[PDB]
Amino acid sequence: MVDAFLGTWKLVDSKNFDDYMKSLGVGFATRQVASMTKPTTIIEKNGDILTLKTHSTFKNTEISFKLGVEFDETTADDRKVKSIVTLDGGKLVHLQKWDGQETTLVRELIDGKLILTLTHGTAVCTRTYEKEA
């Protein structure tokens, strides 16, 4: 199920993150710092509650959720959203809704790497994470 996603992951590639942030209305100064930040993402489970931590030198976030149960979230860029995370096709799909807008954060495993695809508007960003021991 979710088990192969669990652990500590480090950013090792990023494509079109500025486009994604700009689509969300993130200001230039934040985008600038974010473009040079390499987060660590930690995914943990306790029974069927998942906790997803994102740690960096700039912004930190943490969310806890049950798969398939909506939760309130305040994102790194300070959007207050209604969220749900589900497994779909073996991918961990995180959908955020606010003001009639939506964005998806889709995680999948390819060759042992965690590929995060972020879509908002027409912007599609692909971030690659590798596992840490």
Ligand SMILES: CCCCCC/C=C\CCCCCCCC(=O)O
């Ligand atoms: C997490 C470090 C940079 C974040 C700075 C805030 C700017 C934009 C937030 C966009 C939504 C969250 C993106 C997460 C990207 C990721 O987990 O690699």
